[PDB]
Structures are given as C-alpha cells and as structure tokens.
C-alpha cells in the first residue's frame with residue numbers, strides 16, 4: 001500500500017546535486033530537501049531514480065521497492081525511507097537517509113593501513129585508527145539489521161559489504177542498490193545463463209537449486225564477515241570462479257582465515273558456511289554471540 005498523505009514530498013522542495021556512483025538503469029543522486037523530517041529544516045539526502053534506457057519494467061520495480069520500504073518500517077541498521085515523489089509530470093524518486101562514508105567494502109580497503117588490533121596508551125588514543133572493536137561492532141550491527149528484516153518476513157538476496165553503508169558515529173546500514181549499480185560492468189557479478197549473479201556470496205542450494213531463504217542470507221553474512229576481517233579484500237583470492245569452484249564448494253571446500261581475524265570470528269564464518277541450511281545459526285543467535293564477543297573484546 002502507498003499512504004500518500006504521509007510519504008509524498010513536493011518536487012519543488014528537493015534540490016538535486018551530484019550523482020553518487022555509476023548505475024545501469026538506475027542512479028543515486030545527492031540532494032538537499034527542505035523540511036522532509038523536521039519542520040522547515042534543510043537536510044542532505046540520497047535520491048534513487050531511473051535514467052535514460054530504463055523502461056516501464058524498471059519503473060514497476062522501483063515502485064515495488066518503495067512499497068517494500070513502507071512495509072518494513074524503520075530500524076537503526078537499515079537505510080530508512082524519508083519520502084517519495086510519485087505524482088504525474090515528473091520521474092519516480094525514492095528518498096532515503098544520506099550515509100556520508102559510502103559503502104563498507106570501499107571504506108575498509110582505503111583505511112587498511114590505519115588499523116591496530118588494540119589501542120595502546122597514550123599515543124594511539126587521539127589517532128583515529130580502526131580496531132578489532134570497530135570490526136566486531138560493524139558485524140554485530142549488520143546481524144541486528146538482518147534479524148529485524150527476518151522479523152518483517154523479508155530476505156535480502158544480495159547481502160555483501162558493497163551493500164552496507166557507513167554513517168556518522170560508527171552506525172552501519174543495510175541497503176540494496178539494485179539497478180543503481182552497474183552489475184554488467186562489476187566483476188562481483190558473474191554471467192550465469194541469461195543473468196548476472198553474485199556467485200562468491202551465494203550458498204550451494206542457491207547456486208545449484210535456485211533456493212533463496214533467510215538461511216542462504218546467513219551464508220552470505222559469513223562471506224561479509226570475511227570481507228570485514230580482511231579489511232575489504234575480494235573473496236576466494238586466486239580462485240577461478242567456474243564449474244570446479246561450484247563443485248568444490250558443494251563438497252565442503254571453504255575459505256582460509258583472513259589476515260585481521262581472531263579464532264572465534266573465523267569459527268563464526270565456518271558455522272555460517274555449514275553445508276546444511278538448517279544447521280547454520282539464525283540471525284537472533286548471531287546477535288547473541290557477537291554481543292558477547294564485543295563484551296569480551298572490551
């Protein structure tokens with residue numbers, strides 16, 4: 001359902017700026033909205049819209065994303081809906097909260113050198129280094145966001161560090177770029193039949209049986225944990241993503257531990273990658289386990 005009296009924002013109160021990243025049939029644009037959340041207050045926002053080449057099919061898909069966002073509602077660890085421009089005479093525009101540091105994969109990679117496992121007093125205190133505490137904290141926040149999405153009877157289907165945005169005060173948010181990411185140019189997406197799929201993040205029942213469940217999102221979460229504790233490296237380094245790769249994964253071949261992990265975080269990755277989906281932990285279990293590691297790390 002679309003509740004207009006609430007979500008409809010006037011096009012003349014939105015000031016479009018520079019494009020953020022590159023898309024195929026969609027585009028994300030930085031903008032400044034007047035009084036979208038607080039009365040008569042300017043606010044920087046991100047706007048998702050279509051571009052030249054898009055058809056009626058992509059327009060239906062963008063409207064579906066807006067309806068899903070209305071249904072889900074807000075949570076701290078999900079990129080939240082602020083409003084929309086749906087009225088005739090202009091393009092469909094979906095307005096969300098702005099996350100100033102961008103996606104997590106790019107962020108962690110750019111800051112790989114500015115990392116220390118623990119801050120040793122007094123010099124490290126005033127230096128803005130990334131630590132094990134930060135990494136376990138981002139991991140725990142994504143598990144909380146995913147537990148919330150499961151509670152609303154939703155499944156992600158493209159969970160990865162490139163679909164995590166970093167906001168102020170170390171808050172991370174789950175998102176979905178959709179066709180606002182150029183998946184035809186992006187090496188993370190592999191051609192399989194008539195489609196471009198994220199093979200390195202997909203569970204065996206997803207690759208071989210086309211089965212998508214909350215437990216195959218748990219498998220992708222295990223991959224996301226590897227990307228965080230490798231500080232933005234690409235999964236399965238040196239491995240050719242072909243028929244042999246899929247065969248080995250189906251027989252129990254798994255990734256070796258990343259460079260910045262602790263033994264218990266690598267053991268969490270292995271559990272997420274259990275061959276049997278029912279034997280993988282739930283998102284509620286992951287929240288419990290990560291919370292305890294964050295208390296042990298302190």
Ligand SMILES: CCn1cc(CC(=O)Nc2ccc(Oc3ncnc4cc(OC)c(OC)cc34)cc2)cn1
Pocket residue numbers: 020021028046047048065069078079096097098099100101102103156165174175176177
């Ligand atoms: C899982 C729940 N769910 C959410 C949806 C819709 C959705 O996530 N839409 C979406 C996704 C990404 C967007 O992009 C950005 N948003 C905020 N800030 C950004 C900041 C950026 O750079 C500093 C930037 O650079 C590339 C991109 C930014 C905008 C809208 C569907 N399901």
